[PDB]
Amino acid sequence: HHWGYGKHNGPEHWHKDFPIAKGERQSPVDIDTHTAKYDPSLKPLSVSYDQATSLRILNNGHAFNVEFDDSQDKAVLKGGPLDGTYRLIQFHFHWGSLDGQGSEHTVDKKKYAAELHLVHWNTKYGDFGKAVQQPDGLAVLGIFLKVGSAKPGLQKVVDVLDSIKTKGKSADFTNFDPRGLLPESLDYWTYPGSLTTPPLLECVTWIVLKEPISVSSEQVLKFRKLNFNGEGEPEELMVDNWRPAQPLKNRQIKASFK
Numbered sequence: 538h539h540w541g542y543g544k545h546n547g548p549e550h551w552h553k554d555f556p557i558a559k560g561e562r563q564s565p566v567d568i569d570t571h572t573a574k575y576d577p578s579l580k581p582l583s584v585s586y587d588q589a590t591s592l593r594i595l596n597n598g599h600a601f602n603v604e605f606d607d608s609q610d611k612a613v614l615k616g617g618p619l620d621g622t623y624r625l626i627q628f629h630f631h632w633g634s635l636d637g638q639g640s641e642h643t644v645d646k647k648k649y650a651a652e653l654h655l656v657h658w659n660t661k662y663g664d665f666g667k668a669v670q671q672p673d674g675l676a677v678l679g680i681f682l683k684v685g686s687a688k689p690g691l692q693k694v695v696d697v698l699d700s701i702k703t704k705g706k707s708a709d710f711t712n713f714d715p716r717g718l719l720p721e722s723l724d725y726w727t728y729p730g731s732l733t734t735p736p737l738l739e740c741v742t743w744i745v746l747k748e749p750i751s752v753s754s755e756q757v758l759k760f761r762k763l764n765f766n767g768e769g770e771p772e773e774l775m776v777d778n779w780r781p782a783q784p785l786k787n788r789q790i791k792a793s794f795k
């Protein structure tokens with residue numbers, strides 16, 4: 538597959554190789570704040586990252602992933618809409634060419650400059666590859682980024698990007714603390730959806746935080762220096778790696794906050 542975000546292989550084309558692209562639980566979606574209902578059923582959300590062990594950062598030609606050791610229950614997400622325990626496997630971002638676009642989810646049609654996704658798999662399925670085949674297989678924590686003040690906790694990522702400029706490059710990336718990327722409040726919206734890149738599997742419980750984090754213009758300019766291409770190939774800046782909002786269809790978005 539040769540899917541991307543370019544002029545001729547971008548999201549509007551994905552359905553040809555991945556027909557689930559036009560399915561009933563696709564992501565991202567617009568979050569209409571006036572129609573999302575507070576849900577008293579939601580249990581407290583527990584983001585338990587004290588023991589998180591990062592290993593590596595990789596430019597995969599469509600974003601970069603910070604990868605974690607998920608061989609035991611070290612960094613987990615529980616509670617909220619979730620049943621059981623979800624293990625952190627990687628985080629990545631989606632961002633734009635300019636600050637007025639870049640997020641995948643939108644809030645009353647507002648696009649943010651970027652969106653961070655912390656991806657977790659349901660331990661009841663044993664491994665990630667089994668979990669993505671199940672409707673309750675993954676939990677993705679999405680966090681909006683706006684451009685303002687610098688995020689101290691992001692700077693360790695920013696400073697390694699120069700070393701992974703092109704597709705296929707990786708760098709060691711140990712002792713990174715993902716708690717440094719959280720906003721102050723964990724109020725959220727939740728709905729059932731999908732992976733936002735091919736193969737677009739419909740296996741995700743989305744938990745999208747209402748409070749964005751702030752990053753500096755200098756920080757996001759360094760993201761926009763990455764390349765989609767491999768070493769020595771014609772340079773294509775890694776920008777606008779976001780899928781646009783998809784039809785909500787029958788689904789309800791629930792709010793954790795009154």
Ligand SMILES: [Zn+2]
Nearest residue numbers: 629631654733
């Ligand atoms: Zn993502």
